[PDB]
């Protein structure tokens, strides 16, 4: 069967920059190759078919080239709206020839924006379950942040789970939830809870005291 080897696995380029993605076919597939864009949490979208033909509405900035065993997608004048995973697909008319490349996760580098931070103390009924979950949110930031949690000044190393939204289509910014989970016994044994959102040497904190909330 035909294997499509897509490189690179991921790339980041600045707004206005150029992204070059390659697919190698293990056997010649002539001109039978398509490219799809898939934004996080959404369905794939056809960009290009027949190696180079644009799907209607798809801008000229997306350029497909190649033939045989070697194919290229070039995305010019990169936009925040272009942040997506891109996949090639052999579209050759034989089931042993059809397959997708492994994808390329394309991040877009926009302007730096420092996060603001929100913290959400657990509700009384949440504490009553025996399992406390504290939620922190980092708002509208770029580039990536690292998050740490402090409990009476002690950095936490377990019970932390993070989840990041897609890049904003207009300004490239992310949003993130960070959640800290502890037993209510552990929760009730400490006072100050701090979410600390860091970009390099700069951190933004939000804190509360368990008894205050």
């Amino acid at each position: 069967d035909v294997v499509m080897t897509q490189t690179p696995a991921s790339v980041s380029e600045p707004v206005g920059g150029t992204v070059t993605i390659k697919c190698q076919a293990s056997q010649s597939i002539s001109s039978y190759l398509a490219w799809y864009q898939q934004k996080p949490g959404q369905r794939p979208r056809l960009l290009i078919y027949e190696t180079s033909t644009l799907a209607s509405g798809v801008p000229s900035r997306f350029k497909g080239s190649g033939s045989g065993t070697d194919f290229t997608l070039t995305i010019s004048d990169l936009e925040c709206a272009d942040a997506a995973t891109y996949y090639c697909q052999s579209t050759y008319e034989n089931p042993t020839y059809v397959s997708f490349g492994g994808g390329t996760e394309v991040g877009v580098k926009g302007d730096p924006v420092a996060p603001t931070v929100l913290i959400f103390p657990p509700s009384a009924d949440l504490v009553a379950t025996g399992t406390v979950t504290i939620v922190c949110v980092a708002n509208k930031y770029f580039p990536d942040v690292t998050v740490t949690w402090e409990v009476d000044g002690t950095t936490q190393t377990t019970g932390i789970e993070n989840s990041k939204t897609p890049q904003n289509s207009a300004d490239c910014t992310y949003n993130l939830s960070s959640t800290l989970t502890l037993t209510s016994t552990e929760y009730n044994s400490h006072k100050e809870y701090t979410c600390k959102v860091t970009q390099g040497t700069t951190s933004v904190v939000q804190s509360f005291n368990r008894g205050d909330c």
Binding site: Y32, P44, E50, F100, L126, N162, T165
Partner: protein, 210 residues
């Protein structure tokens, strides 16, 4: 004109299930359709295709694992003997004329194959500590559910501006959790539907934790 998948659900390994792809605005007399899947956090994988004349071909790995068929309004995908690794979103796709690629995709339907039992979400309100001085962001924590997805709306779907619903994360227990937050000009209600357990929970969120 459009494609919509249905029938994704939670089953135990070995339990057959069938997914339906309902088309509108074009005829299956004219168009071929194919199925693609995508394991959580993974890439696209082609399953097989059915021509407008009913001729079916399968990816080599897929042979004997799936059966494709068509009706007057649908193409369908039977998964003969599901395994944990068949947990994926399944898409149906309309083939464009010149190659075996696709122009129209559905939103996908999510198949979960697991020995864990379904669990309705528990919902908890998210608000600033009692007394914080304000625009306010409120939210709902939605946890302990299986399978995905939940549908989170605010004010019965009438509130869509300023909403951020974070991607769910699966814990070691197999259960999922997410928070949804909404920013408003200084009451909001989150509605948490879980089609799997046919449950809907509403939480009107106080503006603080007092």
């Amino acid at each position: 004109q459009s494609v919509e998948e249905s029938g994704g659900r939670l089953v135990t390994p070995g339990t057959p299930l069938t997914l339906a792809c309902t088309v509108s605005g074009f005829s299956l007399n004219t168009y071929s359709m194919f199925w693609v899947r995508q394991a959580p956090g993974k890439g696209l994988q082609w399953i097989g295709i059915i021509s407008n004349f009913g001729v079916i071909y399968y990816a080599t790995w897929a042979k004997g694992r799936f059966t494709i068929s068509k009706t007057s309004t649908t193409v369908d995908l039977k998964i003969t003997s599901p395994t944990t690794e068949d947990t994926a979103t399944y898409f149906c796709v309309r083939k464009y004329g010149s190659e075996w690629g696709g122009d129209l995709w559905g939103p996908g339907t999510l198949v979960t194959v697991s020995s864990g039992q379904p669990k309705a979400p528990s919902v908890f309100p998210l608000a600033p500590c009692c007394g914080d001085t304000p625009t306010v962001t409120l939210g709902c924590l939605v946890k302990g559910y299986l399978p995905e997805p939940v549908t989170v709306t605010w004010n019965s779907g009438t509130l869509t501006n300023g909403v951020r619903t974070f991607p769910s994360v699966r814990q070691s227990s197999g259960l999922y959790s997410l928070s949804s937050v909404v920013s408003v000009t200084s009451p909001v209600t989150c509605n948490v539907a879980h089609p799997a357990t046919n449950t809907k929970v509403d939480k009107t969120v106080a503006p603080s934790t007092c």
